[PDB]
Design a binder for these strands. Structure first.
Ligand SMILES: [Mg+2]
Ligand SMILES: [Mg+2]
Ligand SMILES: [Mg+2]
Ligand SMILES: [Mg+2]
Ligand SMILES: [Mg+2]
Ligand SMILES: [Mg+2]
Ligand SMILES: [Mg+2]
Ligand SMILES: [Mg+2]
Ligand SMILES: [Mg+2]
Ligand SMILES: [Mg+2]
Ligand SMILES: [Mg+2]
Ligand SMILES: [Mg+2]
Ligand SMILES: [Mg+2]
Ligand SMILES: [Mg+2]
Ligand SMILES: [Mg+2]
Ligand SMILES: [Mg+2]
Ligand SMILES: [Mg+2]
Ligand SMILES: [Mg+2]
Ligand SMILES: [Mg+2]
Ligand SMILES: [Mg+2]
Lengths: 206, 262, 153
RNA sequence: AAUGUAGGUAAGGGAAGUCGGCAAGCCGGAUCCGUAACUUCGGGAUAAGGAUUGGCUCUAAGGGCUGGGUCGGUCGCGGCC
RNA sequence: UACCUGGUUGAUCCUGCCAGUAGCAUAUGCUUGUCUCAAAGAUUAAGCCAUGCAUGUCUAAGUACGCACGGCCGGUACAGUGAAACUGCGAAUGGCUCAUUAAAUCAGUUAUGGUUCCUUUGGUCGCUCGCCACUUGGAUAACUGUGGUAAUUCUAGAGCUAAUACAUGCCGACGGGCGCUGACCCCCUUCGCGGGGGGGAUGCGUGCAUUUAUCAGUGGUGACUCUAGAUAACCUCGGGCCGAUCGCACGCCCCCCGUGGCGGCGACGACCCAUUCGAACGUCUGCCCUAUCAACUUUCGAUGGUAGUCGCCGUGCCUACCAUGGUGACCACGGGUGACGGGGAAUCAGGGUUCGAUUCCGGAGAGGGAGCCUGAGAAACGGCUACCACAUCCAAGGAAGGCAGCA
RNA sequence: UAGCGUAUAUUAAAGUUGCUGCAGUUAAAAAGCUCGUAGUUGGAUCUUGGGAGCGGGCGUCCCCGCCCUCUCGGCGGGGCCCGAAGCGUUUACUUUGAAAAAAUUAGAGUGUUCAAAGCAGGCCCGAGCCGCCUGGAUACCGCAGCUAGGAAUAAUGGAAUAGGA
RNA sequence: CGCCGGGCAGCUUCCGGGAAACCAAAGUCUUUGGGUUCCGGGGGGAGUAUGGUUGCAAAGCUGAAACUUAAAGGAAUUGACGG
RNA sequence: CGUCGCUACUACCGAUUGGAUGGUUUAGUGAGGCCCUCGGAUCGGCCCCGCCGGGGUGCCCUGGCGGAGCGCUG
């Protein structure tokens, strides 16, 4: 089948190599997983040594870590916005190891209010009062308020992440390899990497 | 081949097994175990060619299946079990104990030991790693691993494993001036004292060893088993005290023995 | 030039860049920490590798490669490839029948880190074996010595 | 209607018709490959031979114009150093 | 034993070849009394094969309601011997041959800090707080019966019956501890505020394996982005572990009592770690003849970079975007080989020249190619699928092939 | 001589492939001549002599002793000592050591009835030996790779716009 | 009339070599190694066939095999013969 | 010594857009396996629930025919 051998290639000098054996099993290849976005679909394949590999054919959720805030949440992937290897992968919305995607910012927002007690992503407020009124006040005691206003001082978020939270979608880079582990873990883009990828997307379109 | 080999040709067997050429085509092919097949002594040839307790493989199979052969304090029924270096072979029905030690010519000799000495065993630690929950471990020259060792024990030192418990009672550091034994190569079977250790980063360390008679040799670090605290061995040495003597002073010893016996 | 000359973002995987810019940190300017390691065997990591900005995943000092195996030497022949050069090793092959030698050579493609900038044709490079970096590359330049130069007229 | 003049089509065969492939038919544009003998070395050569070609939705590449100021130390919300 | 002799001339010194001479290694001819070893369809045809055999396997310790035998000791789940069959393991070793193969195989050296690993051996298996457990559900073999085809180690329908097969799934440890969240309370500088700490009800996660991201720096390397810690979370319905298993003698506690709780020796089993057998791809150096083969490689990967895909893993292995490289008179590239490579064999002053199909190691192949299931391990051929060439039976509807295994 | 002849491949003879080790006026043979790149080969020169008791006997022989530096000398503060760091170049070379499968080759031992072989075997036994002593060596294994001594020979470099120690 | 150096040579010599003719190089060679280039391997077929390449052409360079043959050759000696 | 004539043998050139047998390949067609996206011949569970039933007491603990809930599912 698909072979991963080295003896089908030309020599470094450019000469043609002649195979001294037919294709062996251990030097095989398998078709690409081509992980798309959709309801979960994972196929188990048996690999060398009897071990197991997960072809994620379709994925919709993944575990992404903020990093700066050390907040790691299982969120939902919306779509793929950029891919360094191929633009066709972006067009087909294929999830690969290094493609950057749009993920839901809802769990990170909720953790931000539950940990810092600051609005994030809200425009004018007074829209979810039966829940956010509890979290703004908490009618808490002196020691708890001392902890919270101790944590208020370093509650600064970059304007880029703030705009993304206003839009409701963060953009994050995958780190795992779907089609090998069957999942789409990753990390939220922030800082100079975020600026670089934003400029790349803007140059691509707009 | 399409998989692992499970045959061993008679002429391709290890030289120290002392097998001949005309008995047959195949060799015991020892099963997998604590020691590599190159430096192991399978029980079939130990009980057929060394002790002559059995004349054939079927007879040694009967001896093993009657559950008299005890290796390291445990009954082993495998006909081709790889014994290996300094594992105690205990036979209680006839009441003798064997310690498997190389002779001066790099071959496993028939060394008989007392039961109170057979109760223990020396091991050479091969690696030390910390595992989960921060638990130190210790893997010896056998396949034997143990937990919670003395933190002073480092790599390629010697430990005193007493049988029936598997625990450590004492240990010898790998230090200059300690009695050792060469477990591979040309100098196999030579007892001497660690005199020097030169280390080559990215390669094999070379240790220089002098015996009792003053003959100095050297070998790679992986071939050294520390056997004594300074100069007293912790075990009983075989005949010749592991002193390799040349053919010139072997021939006249043979002549003197013949003259005495005649 | 700038280090972001690729479609992807070039960074060292070990260093975390986004260390929570807050009021206690006077921004700016806080220099980005660099990842480097000593490779052992007596080789010293160059100061350019210490305080450079280049990103090279195949650099022996600032990359994910471990030097193990054979340490050998060669003479630089061409520098026409990206981040890698070809070197020539000259040796004498013994021919028993005539009791004489035979002048032979082999060309090796080795990876050259950006930490070595003053590299010219004819310089003597000590290289060390690593894992296969490409189809024909298995060695990294660890040390560079000039060929009776160190001065330009 | 015949016969004609001009234009088409025709199963199966494929020049057996005829002085003779006359006439008709086949091929044909462009792109990508690939091209022999011979030769006055220029050619032969579009040799020969092969593949592709629509519609729709996109993606990349190939350019041109301006402006890049560190500022009220100030008055010709503007100007000279 | 570092060796020569005849032949050009009328005759002589030479050059020079022819011929002689000795060994071994194939065949052949003639001859052949004894005895000990011993090669043996390699050379041509890796050409074609009738027939027969060459891989099967059960201990007390997975499943016996076959009468196929049999102790019954006779009112009892199962005495025992056990066919068949399910399950498990093996069948990837061995054996044969040398067609392919010219930096390829292979030899020595070194690495895998770039990988997988059945089995053996040794660790680990109450670390996890979460109306069956004195034991859960269904099916299927073997077996009875009804058949079909000319045929096969072909099988269908119907009816039963098991599990260490296939599934499902608790209790116990288990009291809690730890980390967040914190109702509120208390001791507090007390003072009109701030207070510095103690407790804490209610909630959320806790173990190993996996996949991410982050922090710090118990042991180890020459050198980890090592190992081990800590935090945030994930943990894939063709979805990890956290035992619904089997024998051997049988014994201890009885307060509560009187039917329960306990116990030893094993076997099987496991996620993971280590070890063993290895395997796979790599590093350096080394191969015969040929220039009437001097320039090759590169659209269709050639050399390198970046990011991925795939693979057990490192890598143009493949894809996308870039760069224009890479190899050669130190013989590239191409061609030939009556080339498997090596350990070795013949010959023997020294140096060499030839031979290694051939019993040991490594490789490759099973008529030629190609593609796969299973399994730890096969691109297996005494496994399957298809095509080509041969070729068997046929009732012409189909069915079955692979001796470069032993004969 | 129970073997011998013949054919063929190959080896020695063949110093008729010549590295050792052939020839090239006339026997076969040096290009018509010169330049010239790869290749091959390249002049001389840098430490010699003087010392002490062991000493191929100062026995004016000479086993031979030689009359690198700096760092905790492991017997923050002793002379009772010898370990951590580097080499005032890099190599070739030479010697040593390691690691180099077995069989085969050479070769040790062993009366296979001798030998080719094989890896065995031998001592007593008065009969009770309710058994004793051994062997299964060693050498070679090219080239390449590793280690430690030596520094003649050969290559290679250090300070010249001093950008030197 | 001499001396020196580089040349064209000559005479002579038991330096030595060589099969000898002869050669102060054709010597310093079994007492075999200063460095290096080209090139021969019995006589024919044959410098032929074919391929390549150069040339306007004539031709030049590179360059086989089948087959055939026991000698072909070199230097010297004696004789015979010589328009 | 060479031409010419006769007889053998060996090669060479040569129209025949000669012939045969191998090998490597372009292009076209393309079996089969594997992967993906569908597909759904069948086989089971829940909702059974036209009903007799029912016991802590028309309010079922269910011991079965039976329609089929004409759905949810594997
Ligand atoms: Mg027609
Ligand atoms: Mg037609
Ligand atoms: Mg006609
Ligand atoms: Mg006609
Ligand atoms: Mg016409
Ligand atoms: Mg034409
Ligand atoms: Mg189209
Ligand atoms: Mg298995
Ligand atoms: Mg062959
Ligand atoms: Mg062979
Ligand atoms: Mg073999
Ligand atoms: Mg095969
Ligand atoms: Mg096959
Ligand atoms: Mg010969
Ligand atoms: Mg000659
Ligand atoms: Mg001549
Ligand atoms: Mg030159
Ligand atoms: Mg010189
Ligand atoms: Mg010369
Ligand atoms: Mg000739």
């Amino acid at each position: 089948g698909i072979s991963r051998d080295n003896w089908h290639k030309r020599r470094k000098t450019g000469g043609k190599r002649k195979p001294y054996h037919k294709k062996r099993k251990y030097e095989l290849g398998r078709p690409a997983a081509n992980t798309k976005i959709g309801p979960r679909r994972i196929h188990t394949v048996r690999v060398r040594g009897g071990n197991k590999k997960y072809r994620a054919l379709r994925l919709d959720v993944g575990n992404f870590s903020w990093g700066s805030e050390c907040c790691t949440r299982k969120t939902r992937i919306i779509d793929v916005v950029y891919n360094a290897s191929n633009n066709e992968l972006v067009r087909t919305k294929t999830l690969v190891k290094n493609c950057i995607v749009l993920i839901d910012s809802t769990p990170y927002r909720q953790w931000y209010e539950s940990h810092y007690a600051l609005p994030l992503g809200r425009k004018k407020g007074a829209k979810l009062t039966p829940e956010e009124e509890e979290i703004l006040n908490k009618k808490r005691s002196k020691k708890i308020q001392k902890k919270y206003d101790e944590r208020k001082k370093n509650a600064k978020i970059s304007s880029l992440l703030e705009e993304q939270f206003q839009q409701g979608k963060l953009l994050a880079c995958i780190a795992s390899r779907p089609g090998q582990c069957g999942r789409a873990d990753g990390y939220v883009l922030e800082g100079k990497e975020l600026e670089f990828y934003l400029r790349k997307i803007k140059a691509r379109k707009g | 081949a399409r998989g692992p080999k499970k045959h061993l040709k008679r002429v391709a067997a290890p030289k120290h097994w002392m097998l001949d050429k005309l008995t047959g085509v195949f060799a015991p092919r020892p099963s997998t175990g604590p020691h590599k097949l190159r430096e192991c002594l399978p029980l079939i040839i130990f009980l057929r060619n060394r002790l002559k307790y059995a004349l054939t493989g079927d007879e040694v199979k009967k001896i093993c299946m009657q559950r008299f052969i005890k290796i390291d304090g445990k009954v082993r029924t495998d006909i081709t079990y790889p014994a290996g270096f300094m594992d105690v072979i205990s036979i209680d029905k006839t009441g003798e104990n064997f310690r498997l030690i190389y002779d001066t010519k790099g071959r496993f000799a028939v060394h008989r030991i007392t039961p109170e000495e057979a109760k223990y065993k020396l091991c050479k630690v091969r690696k030390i790693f910390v595992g989960t929950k921060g638990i130190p471990h210790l893997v010896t020259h056998d396949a034997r691993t143990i937990r919670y060792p003395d933190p002073l024990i480092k790599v390629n030192d010697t430990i005193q494993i007493d049988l029936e418990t598997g625990k450590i009672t004492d240990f010898i550091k790998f230090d200059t001036g300690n009695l050792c034994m060469v477990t591979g190569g040309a100098n196999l079977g030579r007892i001497g004292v660690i005199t020097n250790r030169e280390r080559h980063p990215g390669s094999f360390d070379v240790v220089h060893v002098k015996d009792a008679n003053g003959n100095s040799f050297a070998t790679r670090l992986s071939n050294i088993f520390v056997i004594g605290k300074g100069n007293k061995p912790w075990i009983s040495l075989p005949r010749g005290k592991g002193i390799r003597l040349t053919i010139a002073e072997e021939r006249d010893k043979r002549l003197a023995a013949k003259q005495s016996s005649g | 030039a700038d280090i972001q000359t690729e479609r992807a973002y070039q960074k060292q995987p070990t260093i975390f860049q986004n260390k929570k810019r807050v009021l206690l940190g006077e921004t700016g300017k806080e220099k980005l920490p660099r990842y480097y390691k000593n490779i052992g065997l007596g080789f010293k990591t160059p100061k350019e590798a210490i305080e450079g900005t280049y990103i090279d995943k195949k650099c022996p000092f600032t990359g994910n490669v471990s030097i193990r195996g054979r340490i050998l030497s060669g003479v630089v022949t061409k520098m026409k490839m990206q981040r890698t050069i070809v070197i020539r090793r000259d040796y004498l092959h013994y021919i028993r029948k005539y009791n004489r030698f035979e002048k032979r050579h082999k060309n090796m493609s080795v990876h050259l880190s950006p930490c070595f900038r003053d590299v010219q044709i004819g310089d003597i490079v000590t290289v060390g074996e690593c894992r296969p970096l490409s189809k024909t590359v298995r060695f990294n330049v660890l040390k560079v010595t000039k060929a009776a130069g160190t001065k330009k007229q």
